[PDB]
Amino acid sequence: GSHSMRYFFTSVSRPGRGEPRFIAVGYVDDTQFVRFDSDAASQRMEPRAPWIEQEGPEYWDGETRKVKAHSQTHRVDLGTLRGYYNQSEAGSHTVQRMYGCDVGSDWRFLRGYHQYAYDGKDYIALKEDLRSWTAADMAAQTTKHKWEAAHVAEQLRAYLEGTCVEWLRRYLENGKETLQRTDAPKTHMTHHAVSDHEATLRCWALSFYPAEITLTWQRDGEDQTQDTELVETRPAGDGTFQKWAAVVVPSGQEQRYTCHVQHEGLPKPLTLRWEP
Amino acid sequence: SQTIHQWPATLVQPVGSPLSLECTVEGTSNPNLYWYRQAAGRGLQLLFYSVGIGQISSEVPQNLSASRPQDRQFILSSKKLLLSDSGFYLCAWSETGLGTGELFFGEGSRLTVLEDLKNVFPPEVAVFEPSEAEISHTQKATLVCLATGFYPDHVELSWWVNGKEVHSGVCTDPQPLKEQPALNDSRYALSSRLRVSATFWQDPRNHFRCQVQFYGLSENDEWTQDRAKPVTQIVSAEAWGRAD
Amino acid sequence: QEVEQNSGPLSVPEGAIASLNCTYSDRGSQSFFWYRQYSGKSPELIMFIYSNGDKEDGRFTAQLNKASQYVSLLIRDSQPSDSATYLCAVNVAGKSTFGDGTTLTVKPNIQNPDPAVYQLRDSKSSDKSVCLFTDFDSQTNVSQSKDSDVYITDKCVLDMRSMDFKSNSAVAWSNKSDFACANAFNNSIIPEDT
């Protein structure tokens, strides 16, 4: 299917006690493969997936240099931004940067992106894709003019459409044992009557990768149901993910309702109903 | 440079000397600062890099240290040098972050680590004035400046006429020559030719001056020979015009 | 080995096009450069480039081919002042890694060679003397003397002269007995007097 690799960066100011805290992490699809944390003793970009430990020290020395560089630009920004927003020295503020590149089944480039946010809000984002920038406000407009003048988009394009994709392919190839794996979900169903008269069916979906999944409900006279409760997909911890959908129905009939699951791991859509 | 300045420019020191190079940048802020080194044959090897103030990374096992006590002040130093430490040390900075990546270098600091200062000699300079043959055949006059018997192998030859420096029509050898190819500690010679017109040379009112800047020993630098200490000095030879 | 570039020295005649190549092994590399370094000076950036294709600025053209890991610099209408050492650089792993550089020499084109070997006397002393072989054509190449007690230099080309004239030169001297100029290494037809 489609794949991607993303890099997330977060810096948080701590006026009065140390330099901003910086945490960088890298992903391929739904799997984290690297991290960096200013508060760790290491001061290096560390591996977080088996298939990445194979890269030689030239790679580590390299990613370590780069990430420090991101970190340093963020420390400066924090400063600049207090200024654009006329904020006091006392407050703590957050800068965030996210970029990466998507590929299709053909392992060819689909799209690139590079977004930036301040105090939890969109600051500036590279269009989808272009040389173009979307600027949230008077402050972001300044940055826009600066970055247009310096051709930051052109540099980012070279990366996103070039390097980013090639290293995505390299990792998918190396970590084929993991990243191409497709784990079909294990599905059980639990029953709970709400003090009689009515009843709920909980359609469980466990041990699957990747996270993208769809489980839905439907009935006899017509399909679809918007009177259903479904929790956001959650990580089990072992590398797989979990999710379930619950629907409220009358104690009578019961078996009348059915639950269909969809996932690339499943060749043909699963559908399980209630049984005594 | 406007953006970045480095010093000293040339250093001749004995093994065991302490080293200190300083670099100051101007025109940007929070710049990435680099100490590169160009040793036996071109090729810049990275020695230290620094993303910010008080942050130094050493790229290789090494007899040197760097420090960044200030935003735009960068220092390279050694408690005591080894012959291996000779080279052309270059300070450089790059826009904060990971931009295009271009570097802006300083003028550069050339360091020569000598094993024995005994071998250091300034140059003797002589200006040989044009022959009347080329002047009545080519109708052009060529003065030839000659610096000789100096060591180490670096000197800066420049021409001066009537107090002003002149580039007009000069050719100074790109590099000197050993006077005794055989010996490893041979002394060196370098030549330069300033070529003027006949009518310019023949005017006895024009003042010609070959000036050779020699980099050598420091004052306070230990010395024991009878001869005067061959420190950094400028040695020069003058000439005047001749109608006949 | 990591950034690989052919050592000099490459000769090109004035006016011709010089071409330089460089190859890099690490596909991590994301931007590429050409610096120029004159003897004694620090390097100076001629061009950078970060996308497949060619980039032109004046007489200089960079070419990048990320597929073949190949970076090139072409110099249109080469001039003698283009003689320098050209450093190829690759921005990778957060730093710039450099090739050992390639040395280029643009031989000047002497429209009209008037080769001649004259001798000059020291201003302070009539005794001290030196021989100046000059105004010869770039096809000629001076050679070091054996039984080295009579010093001779490599040729030297006169920078930004003016008048529409420019000439080659080589000097020879000696503190040996038996004065006079008489070298049997290259070029016949030159006229020394007396």
Binding site: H70, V76, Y123, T143, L156 | G99 | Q30, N91
Partner: peptide, 10 residues
């Protein structure tokens, strides 16, 4: 492979 270029201050 993180971005080696196109990362400037705001």
């Amino acid at each position: 492979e993180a971005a080696g270029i196109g990362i400037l201050t705001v």
